[PDB]
């Protein structure tokens, strides 16, 4: 949390909890300890994919060139 | 009444 | 693909949305309302009939039924407009093209699945329908294969042990209190203080009321004494109009009557006691695995205190060395429709459905041989 | 219902 | 009965 600027106990609260809304109204569920296990290793999965097509992302803003291609 | 009806 | 609808015909409200959504898009209440007053201005644009949130919010003009009680359907042209506001008006989808799971109380007639499947096929052609117990879905919800679920509606109760997947059939009880006639039993009793709710709008008055303000004891006759002995337990609630009303012991002692159905004169036992003479129906076998994994559903569960109540006085009948847990998910008002959601959504699932191809074949009797 | 109860 | 059955 300090890495990444993030109040503590959020984090701490989100971790192991998981929210619910219907239209109306919203429950905030615990999970078991395999559930809390699965959604840490999911989020380190989404964090690295994203980070991996961005900067992929910036080394096409290098590799382009403005003229239009006409093929590939 | 007390709350329904006048009563 | 096309997801299925799923569609939950409470007594009391109306679950529905699309398969795979993990709560349901339109909730409200399965009510229809007409008009029953001299129409003076002219040119105000008339209507028959009023349907859900739109029947509670006129509700002062209108006579509000319900057409499903004890979770059996008591008249088909309102129940039909139920749905087609469900269709049309709150999910906004071409009931053409999604397959629909319904569900059902177990235990009640037959006439009922075959009806609602014709209306199905012939009034709105679904593709494709299926209809499954209220009581299996929530342990789709609960991530269980083993449990002996209690389910609560407005309009009736049920015990139904599953183990390891299969259902007990013979084990099944069903007990016909619910929401709906402890608010009756709630209007009875606030008549003592004066407060007198009569008509069926008023009526859905004291449903907010129990809703809000009644809790279940942990020892009835204890806070019954201290009740007569003290404010401490007096709370009180504002009418629409700002009529304020004071309310006393009297809050506990309406959901006291699922553990003493005496108190409306109903010959039965209590939740707990059925719950128990549910799990001694089963093999000696399973009873360790259905005194564990005690499931709450349903809205009627919801009360505070209620879990704790049922963990006590089961724990008085059980062997003093069985783990008797209840397990009660805060989300346990849509259980049954989560768990639907999840069933319509496997792909194992996709062969189970009823294909209008075989409800041409078969007819409507099609639905007790392709189902539980 | 039809029979033991009022639906 | 005592055990098996209820009575
Ligand atoms: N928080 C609550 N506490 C007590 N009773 C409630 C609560 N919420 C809803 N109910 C009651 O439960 C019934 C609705 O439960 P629900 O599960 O929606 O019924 P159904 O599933 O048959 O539509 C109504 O009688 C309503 O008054
Ligand atoms: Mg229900």
């Given amino acids: 949390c300090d890495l990444m600027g993030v109040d503590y106990e959020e984090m701490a609260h989100w971790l192991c909890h998981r929210k619910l809304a219907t239209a109306t109204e919203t429950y905030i569920k615990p999970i078991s300890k395999l559930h809390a296990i699965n959604a840490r290793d999911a989020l380190a999965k989404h964090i690295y994919a994203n980070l991996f097509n961005w900067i992929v992302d910036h080394v096409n803003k290098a590799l382009h060139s403005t003229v239009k291609q006409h093929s590939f | 009444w007390x709350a329904x009806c006048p009563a | 693909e096309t997801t299925a609808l799923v569609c939950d015909n409470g007594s009391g409200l109306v679950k529905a949305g699309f398969a795979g959504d993990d709560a349901p898009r339109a909730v409200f209440p399965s ?25 509670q919010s006129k509700r002062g003009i209108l006579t509000l039924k319900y057409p499903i009680e004890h979770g059996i359907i008591t008249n088909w042209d309102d129940m039909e407009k139920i749905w087609h506001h469900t269709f049309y008006n709150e999910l906004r989808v071409a009931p053409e093209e999604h397959p629909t799971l319904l569900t059902e109380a177990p235990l009640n007639p037959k006439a009922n699945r075959e009806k609602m499947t014709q209306i199905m096929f012939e009034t709105f052609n679904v593709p494709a329908m299926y209809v499954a117990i209220q009581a299996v879905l929530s342990l789709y919800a609960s991530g269980r294969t083993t449990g002996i679920v209690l389910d609560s509606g407005d309009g009736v109760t049920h015990n139904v042990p599953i183990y390891e997947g299969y259902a007990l059939p013979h084990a099944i009880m069903r007990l016909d209190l619910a929401g709906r006639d402890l608010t009756d039993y709630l209007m009875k009793i606030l008549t003592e203080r004066g407060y007198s709710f009569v008509t069926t709008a008023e009526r859905e008055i004291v449903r907010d009321i129990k809703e809000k303000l009644c809790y279940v004891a942990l020892d009835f006759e204890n806070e019954m004494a201290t009740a007569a002995s003290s404010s401490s337990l007096e709370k009180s609630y504002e009418l629409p109009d700002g009529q304020v009303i004071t309310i006393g012991n009297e809050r506990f002692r309406c959901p006291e009557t699922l553990f003493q159905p ?3 004169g109903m010959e039965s036992a209590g939740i707990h006691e059925t719950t128990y003479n549910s799990i001694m129906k089963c093999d000696i076998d399973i009873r360790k695995d259905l005194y564990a994994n005690n499931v709450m559903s349903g809205g009627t569960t919801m009360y505070p205190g209620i879990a704790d109540r049922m963990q006590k006085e089961i724990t008085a009948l059980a062997p003093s060395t069985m783990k008797i847990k209840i397990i009660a998910p805060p989300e346990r008002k ?23 191809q075989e409800y041409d074949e078969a007819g409507p009797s099609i639905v007790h041989r392709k189902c539980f």
């Fill in chain 3, 334 to 356: 849509y259980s049954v429709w989560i768990g639907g959601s999840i069933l319509a959504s496997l792909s194992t699932f996709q062969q189970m459905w009823i294909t209008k």
């Fill in chain 3, 31 to 55: 009510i229809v309302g007409r008009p029953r007053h001299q129409g003076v201005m002219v040119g105000m644009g008339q209507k028959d009939s009023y349907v859900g949130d739109e029947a």
């Fill in chain 3, 262 to 264: 005496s108190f409306i």
